[model samples]
Target: DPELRSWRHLVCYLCFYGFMAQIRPGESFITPYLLGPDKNFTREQVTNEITPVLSYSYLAVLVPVFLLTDYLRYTPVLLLQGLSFVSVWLLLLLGHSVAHMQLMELFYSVTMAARIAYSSYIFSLVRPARYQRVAGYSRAAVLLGVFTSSVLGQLLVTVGRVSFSTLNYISLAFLTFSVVLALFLKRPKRSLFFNRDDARMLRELGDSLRRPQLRLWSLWWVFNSAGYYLVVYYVHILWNEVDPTTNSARVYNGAADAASTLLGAITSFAAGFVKIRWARWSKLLIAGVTATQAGLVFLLAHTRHPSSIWLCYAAFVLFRGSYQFLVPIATFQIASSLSKELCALVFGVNTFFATIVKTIITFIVSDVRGLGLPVRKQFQLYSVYFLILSIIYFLGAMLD
Candidate 1:
């Protein structure tokens, strides 16, 4: 009777709203807050040392959690997981010592892993036929959230006169809202990669990995993630470097954050259109976008002039902003290849690989930065990472 399923849309939008509420304060801004105020670490030090540790902390939980999610109910797990954010935020707010900050970062990492679990759970709830469309919308939710977070992040730091904790409180509230809304999500029966009965726990795990398409999808996430994190994990550091001695850095940093998010919102809107026009092959656009992202990595390696900094940043914004397009849009395509039962399981596997890549890349970038390497050369290291991503994608396209 209905032309489109709007209830599902509402569910998807709420998830995005949750992201907007959380990401800036929780994911992006927290590092700055910790390294800036509590930890007494430099921006470069935070990106290189802290982010890598942070990446690993979350990734460390991915496998165990993935293995465990199948046994537990999705809703309860998801609802309980929101507490991870709350715990981290409180630690950040209360802990004034290095030991406490380290503990806080560890919690932060796990909370991000919780995000992967939540995304997987959402995918499992949707219909297979609607997967691509839903994924696009879901990604759009994230972009909308990111845009909102960035702008809101700016306001919190600037006009709102609210500290990071205020943002954290907001995130906690929205996450609570998400948990309540998720209560309305009726758990679907096993239909895709997961077989309900006689499902050998690890049976699909190897098959999932061996599948070339699966590997490629995971890799697509890997390189793109690395490229994005390479800069994003360092944005606060960059802000500090560009404006080390003054509050003006906060203003420009906020503006830069807002610019990236605005681009993300536009890209998300465009992806919705492109998903309709491009259909299945829209997945491959990730390769192009990802490759161009590599080019941005290369650009960051060489910029010297003041004008070039913004130019390099523009490229960064384009790739990161546009990344929202490929992410869920690609997930939509991948979901079509399987049934509903296996969706969560398969996505869980994808999360496993992606988390591994992120953790590894984070450490690599972090170590290189930790070694007191120059920023330019440290950036060039990403050239290698993105190049590897491009090659993996080409392999996927050929195999497909």
Candidate 2:
């Protein structure tokens, strides 16, 4: 009689929300729009002043948001995410100053933190028998949302000749629709990852840190993840700078976004079936992948032919695919001995550490108060960052 309690029924509504929330066609096109006449932001302002806030604010709010997510039993954080999305777009459309855009980034971070709620919400909906299958379904839903959004955006720009501001308006409309999707869900009875102050979690984290292989895995999660995000955040701007004068670039960013998302998902899917020996091969494989990414980052940022832009796009695609392929393996490798509760909690702690490193790097390298190199040089730093990561892993790969 209670249809709402069924996972199938509830999952359908969730798919609706997950898919709808991510389909912001303009998301991939943001760098282009900000540099355009409508936003009037100089590339420098966007690079040093605006983009860094997303990382900083994400780091700031993520812990508190997790606590709130658990305290309120998931629904409120989902709704909070919904409101944050709406505010971000509203600021993007109506607010013109650098401060307004910075505010947009701040709100965007809240939405980013609240993202765990959707995935976490999925687990609470069903029994363990359906757990694995439902998670695959949920992640696929969001990935497809990203794919569709990018393609839709590329088509609109390439064929329909839609302006950037108009795309923002369309994005705003979709997010408005998503807010209701968040509201329609029923709150569950139990909470996971409850936020309480205790020495127990600290003791467990220290215990988890002592295992050499697990420590290496956590290190990979921190270093490469930190390096990867810093690269992704800035490289779009580098791509734009490579061909700023070409009006055709309005189409290219969307195409790049769509292609990268496609490759990442395909490789991530393949990774699920390809099993491996974590003790024997994990370090070597991570070093191999990490080194490949370092090389790709060098080429992707440093090269600049109008036609050669497509090559940069390809490098970015493979770069993204490599990271995606290893992500599941590392996740499973780290989750090996721990229960899901500790595994999930420890993973969050790992993420928190990564963001701390990421934010510090941003302050010293990207923000104007520090080195504040040009967008191209910023990526050059990332290349160095990953090389060091790979070298450390190579040392581990050889010894044991």
Candidate 3:
């Protein structure tokens, strides 16, 4: 026995610190502030130039790191992830130049790539049968971490207890603690790609991509990932447009975000109880959520009323949380026939392609050198984008 008891204890410990380490309070709330007048950067620059860096750099680094995680096991990559956060917040607090900001985003993307390692690390500690149950616990820890940190950040800002810049200092502290936690994690004894020949790895990669079912699910993953990130990246901008008061009265914006995060946490937890027979309801669920998402985007764009905006925002959070939870479950379900090793690769590939799409879209919509639509106009474009997605999924459902 490799000592199952020790493995279980290790998994629980990783989940705790992983949760603690992932909270980026400064980045979460201060994103718009940085891009706005506070940082003297235009929304166009932040959205198109700065934000796209995260996607592009993430896409660039993802495959190499993805492979490296398997080859090197999870420990080194996880420590690097912690280091990335430390750099990100340090720059956020000290850097003033656009180039420095871009550098910060680059490290942030590195952290995103490291998350693949974090998610997969637990698999090496547990048996196949226990993967799902353990994965769920870790995922819950992450969500709770996000919710707790977000709420605390909001309270700190709204209560006038901390300045916006001070939040990054706090983030730096939290992330540093996470680094210490990462240092304590036990190295895995085996990896899927561990000691495997390069040629065999390449062959498996090719074969995995060739599967028709994987292709189908990858399409779903790409679109959903792109849409979710698009909304999340710019929703604060949307809030500013609808409520100009948020530019000065930062309190409400943080409160709204904290509320949405809290609600999202609740809905994520609730998603566990809802079961769907994908053969019967997958397309219908896709079509229905797509349409509702389109409708919500439209309302979010067109409405100026704060109360209505808040309501729609909450509903959108609910829908987003549900979709975020369901998509992974659905992906895992679709991959049930595949080897555990392949499941992670499928998602990594899906994310890579999704990042490409997301980066292109962000460029078109947000770059001053490109379409450069203002906040309201960008939302209008997003509404149309989702509407098209809805129609396409609807047709797919009807044709099926």
Reference-based TM-score, model 1: 0.72
Q: Pick the candidate with the highest lDDT.
A: 2
What's the C-alpha lDDT at position 11 in model 2?
70
Question: What ranking emerges by lDDT with the best candidate at the front?
Answer: 2, 3, 1
Q: What is candidate 2's lDDT per residue for 1-400, written digit by digit as tens?
A: 5545665577776677778878887888888888877888899999999999999999999899988888887888998998898899899898899999999999999988898888888776556787787777778889989889998888888877888889888888888888888888777666665642324656776777787668778888988999988878887788878777636334477887888899988888787775354455888888999999999999976797766777887888888888998887888778877765687687888889999998999999999999988898888888888888889888878987
TM-score per candidate, in order? 0.72, 0.94, 0.86
Q: Global CA lDDT of candidate 1, please? A: 0.60
For model 3, what is the alpha-carbon lDDT of residue 362?
72
Clash count, one per candidate: 9, 0, 0
Q: What lDDT score goes with residue 378 in model 2?
A: 86
Off by over 4 Å in 1: 1-27, 37-39, 119-145, 161-218, 252-259, 272-287, 303-313, 368-376, 391-400
The models' CA-based lDDT, in order, is: 0.60, 0.83, 0.71
- Tens-place lDDT per residue, model 3, 23-56, is 7666566565675555667666676667667766
Candidate 1 lDDT, 255-374, residue by residue in tens? 566687787667766776775466545335666776777787777665655534456557667766767677656665556555445666666666666677776655555654435444
Q: Is candidate 1 or candidate 3 better by lDDT?
A: 3
| Between candidates 2 and 3, the lDDT winner | 2
